[PDB]
Nucleic acid binder design. Structure first.
Lengths: 136, 58, 94, 66, 116, 75
RNA sequence: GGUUCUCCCCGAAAGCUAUUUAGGUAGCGCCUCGUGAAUUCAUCUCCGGGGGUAGAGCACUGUUUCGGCAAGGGGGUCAUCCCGACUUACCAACCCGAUGCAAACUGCGAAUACCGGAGAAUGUUAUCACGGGAGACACACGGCGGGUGCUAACGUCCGUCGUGAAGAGGGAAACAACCCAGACCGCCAGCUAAGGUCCCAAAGUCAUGGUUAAGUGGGAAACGAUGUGGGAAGGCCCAGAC
RNA sequence: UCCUCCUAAAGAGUAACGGAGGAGCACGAAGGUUGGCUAAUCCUGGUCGGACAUCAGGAGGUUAGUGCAAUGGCAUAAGCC
RNA sequence: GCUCAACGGAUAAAAGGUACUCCGGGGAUAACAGGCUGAUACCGCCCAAGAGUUCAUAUCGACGGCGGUGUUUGGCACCU
RNA sequence: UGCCUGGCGGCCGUAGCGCGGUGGUCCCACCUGACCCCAUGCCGAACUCAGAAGUGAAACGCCGUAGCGCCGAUGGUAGUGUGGGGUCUCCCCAUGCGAGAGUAGGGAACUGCCAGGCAA
């Protein structure tokens, strides 16, 4: 479970996921998996994606993860009167602005990479596209 | 600053406090009401304030 | 080398830009030396096919504007977030 | 999951039904006091040979002949 | 170094005296030489000045840089101040510790009738 | 285990650059030292800025560190 | 719980503070009547201002991925007791470099809003003060900015505005709180607003060029698909391709 | 009950059984004034001392300190003597 | 000279039970049902390694994702 | 007027550092001594006094240098006041305002008051 160690506050405000992403290009890898929609990405959904995706490359090349949850979602226990403080920390999730580059890879065949990311999209709750690290 | 014709084209019910205060500043009371003033940037600003609901003729 | 028949921008601004960006065209800019920077307007589609080559950011390009062909160079580019499109391209007069 | 010491025992083999209780206590206890669970863990599924054998051959209630 | 050190000490009273609209009495001491002058409440221009660079007192003294040297020119600067009739004077320790020549300097000024 | 806010101590500035005031007129109620008396202004014990002389307020900022000052243009 | 004739004029609030106070009450804000004092006050333009939120950013507070350097340390060669030395199936952070994030982070920094001043037009003098009488101190909803909740609720809690509250009429089939628009009265008069114009039912079976075959329109997504239309480029192409 | 920050939407102000911490003192000096001074943290050398004792140089630059929580602030020091 | 800390402090001084309870009120506020919602529950679907004789698409199908119903417990208190 | 030196203001990070060069008839710094004024919670370091042979290295100032710090267009982009609309957990249209970052380039200053040295 990708999770923030040594944090300052335990719970934070929900905020709004407006605006557009900053990490628009593929820095590390040669190809990227840039997202289309606007949504949330839990730590579990990252594991479902990456682990299932790394099997496609078959232990070849390196996978660069360009995201981190760093935001705790608190939910109330079942059968609880509405009110009386915020709920307990349930998990972690990252806020993704459209056009965000999520994964990077290199030392991998184009079509294998094209297919590996296809499998990754299945576990991801956000629409995405296959992009490559373009020159300049 | 010659004469300038200003007319009201919409209501003042669902309007902003500033807009309401501005509309009475122009003197326009009822809808379709006409009025005459002197063309100056001060008035032009007010004209620009409620342009969405005002028909202006020179 | 790549000849670009671009038009001088009539008006700059946020509204005008998106207005012509909907018209399959997008704005650009040029500068370099003591000369005055000029607001350049051109197509996006065909130019999109031009920048597909890596040599597009190394070649001393030639943008012809109403007879006046300027030898320019591609400094930097501003793209669209997710859709494979362009926003604006910086052109250094070379 | 209804987690057992080693084998997790994933829910789907443990049928959970909500019925009404039995007793006294007013309006709540006679009608709406549901969630009175009736578990049903068949040994035909998981709970490996060592577990299920002592739950099918053993003489005890809360566990049936099947 | 030494300069900046003396500056951080001087700025203290100088700011206070800058906002009081009075003629501040600034002095500048060196091992062999001494300077003295008054400043207008504005801090832009000066009114009078006297130092060891002036022949009028340099010839009269034995050595430029000792107690008596400041005592002589101290009277000199106070006299042209007396010539200008200016009395609203406020002394400035100017970072220099008040005990050496600067001490003897203020005396001749005070003997002339300077209000401070 | 929470919800124990103290009070809104009515901080902030009172006057602005371009307003004529009288002697004793408080300019700003700053807690720290976000400003400093340039001239004709007094820095209270709470480092609050009050006008010692009548006139108009003018905001300035000087020095390499550039800490904002306040003086009074005699009026 | 109830509180009986008539007409004319104006016209609230459901907030703040304290309360053995929380369906009460008191002061204040907001209503009204009379009076006294100012181009007083309101809208716009220009001028002089402070703010740091949005956004952005990552030097500081924390947090994030990876790599070059590289030593602290360790499995070993063994010091077969303490010194010494290499290596490093490694953590690879710290220095150096590249990359994201933050209500309680800020080397930056809007739009609005707010204060003061100058000037013109306009407004029933709408500002302020004094005095008489108040009611009210349970608010709802829509939009926008947010807390909480499941970015659930005709949920709840604040800021701000509108509406209802205390406003009918037209439209949304029906529909306080949505869109339009403020009922002094009469008229078998005309023009329009939102919204609509085959019939029920008043108004174009209007005009022009495209699009869909599903009654789509007329409940709904991830995802799948030789459904089809428009657009650019390219592979290839009568030395003959599918 | 009171104090700090956030929530708070860049004036003030603004709720929640909303999100995190504190106070019910201390001081005759830790106050006033006059004078002087002003770091933290790394690199290195050195007796027991080896990662830190303390001293000495350079770098560095205010992350120091400020009776106590936080916030704003302070070297012209409100910091230290 | 009173942690008059329930801190604008009802008197120096003041704890509980009522299922025989009584009265005045309230859906301004609970229990049942109805309503809104759909966390939970149930139902369907996308993806898929492995088990499965071969083979994931014979069958299950975890890890995760997207919807539907309103029969589960709930949330909310709009009706009484 | 200038090369200047010294004291005092205004414009401010373009106004501050790094590297090399460069100045002393004057001035300044260093430098000499200190029973005695004065000084060290020890020490003439600092401070003060009495003088000043020597030096121009350190220090200070000037010149070149952007090598940096740093400043910073133009355009675009984000956001947003107002009026509408939408597939209204967010965006779009008309309209006005308009960042931060980043790019080109630039950027190591300018000016004033008083007192003397130097050649007129």
């Amino acid at each position: 479970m990708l999770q923030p160690k040594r944090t300052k506050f335990r719970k934070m405000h929900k905020g709004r996921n407006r605006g557009l992403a900053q990490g628009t290009d593929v820095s590390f890898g040669s190809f990227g998996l840039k997202a289309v929609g606007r949504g949330r990405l839990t730590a579990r959904q990252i594991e479902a994606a990456r682990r299932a995706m790394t099997r496609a490359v078959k232990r070849q090349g390196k996978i660069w993860i360009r995201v981190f949850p760093d935001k705790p979602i608190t939910e109330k226990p079942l059968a609880v009167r509405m009110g009386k403080g915020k709920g307990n920390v349930e998990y972690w999730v990252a806020l993704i602005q459209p056009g965000k580059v999520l994964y990077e890879m290199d030392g991998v065949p184009e079509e294998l990479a094209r297919e590996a990311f296809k499998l990754a999209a299945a576990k991801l709750p956000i629409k995405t596209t296959f992009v490559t690290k373009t020159v300049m | 600053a010659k004469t300038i014709k200003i007319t009201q084209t919409r209501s003042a019910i669902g309007r902003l406090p500033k807009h309401k205060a501005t509309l009475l500043g122009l003197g326009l009371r009822r809808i379709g009401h006409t009025v005459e003033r002197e063309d100056t940037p001060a008035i032009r600003g007010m004209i620009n304030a409620v342009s969405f609901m005002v028909k202006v003729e020179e | 080398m790549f000849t670009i028949n671009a038009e001088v921008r009539k008006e700059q601004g946020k509204g005008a830009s998106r207005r012509l960006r909907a018209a399959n065209k997008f704005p650009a800019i040029i500068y370099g030396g003591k000369e005055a920077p000029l607001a350049i307007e051109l197509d996006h589609d065909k130019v999109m096919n031009m920048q597909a080559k890596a040599e597009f950011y190394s070649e001393v390009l030639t943008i012809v504007v109403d007879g006046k062909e300027i030898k320019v160079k591609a400094q930097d580019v501003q793209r669209h977030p997710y859709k494979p499109k362009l926003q604006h391209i910086d052109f250094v007069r070379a | 999951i209804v987690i057992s010491r080693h084998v997790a025992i994933p829910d789907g083999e443990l049928e959970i039904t909500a019925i009404r209780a039995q007793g006294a206590g007013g309006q709540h206890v006679n009608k709406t006091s549901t969630a009175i669970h009736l578990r049903f863990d068949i040994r035909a599924s998981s709970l490996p040979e060592y577990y299920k054998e002592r739950l099918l051959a053993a003489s005890h209630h809360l566990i049936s002949s099947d | 170094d030494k300069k900046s050190a003396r500056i951080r000490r001087a700025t203290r009273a100088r700011r206070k005296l800058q906002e009081l609209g009075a003629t501040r009495l600034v002095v500048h001491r060196t091992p062999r030489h001494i300077y003295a002058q008054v400043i207008a409440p504005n801090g832009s221009e000066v009114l009078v000045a006297a130092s060891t660079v002036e022949k009028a007192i340099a010839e009269q003294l034995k050595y430029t840089g000792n107690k008596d040297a400041a005592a002589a020119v101290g009277k000199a600067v106070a006299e042209r101040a007396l010539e200008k009739g200016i009395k609203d004077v406020s002394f400035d320790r100017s970072g220099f510790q008040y005990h050496g020549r600067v001490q003897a300097l203020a005396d001749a000024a005070r003997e002339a009738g300077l209000q401070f | 285990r929470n919800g124990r806010d103290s009070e809104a101590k009515r901080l902030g500035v009172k006057r602005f650059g371009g307003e004529s005031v009288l002697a004793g007129s408080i300019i700003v109620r700053q807690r720290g030292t976000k400003f400093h008396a340039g001239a004709n202004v007094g820095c209270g014990r709470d480092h609050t800025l009050f006008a010692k002389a009548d006139g108009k307020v003018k905001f300035e900022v000087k020095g390499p560190k550039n800490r904002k000052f306040i003086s009074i243009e005699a009026e």
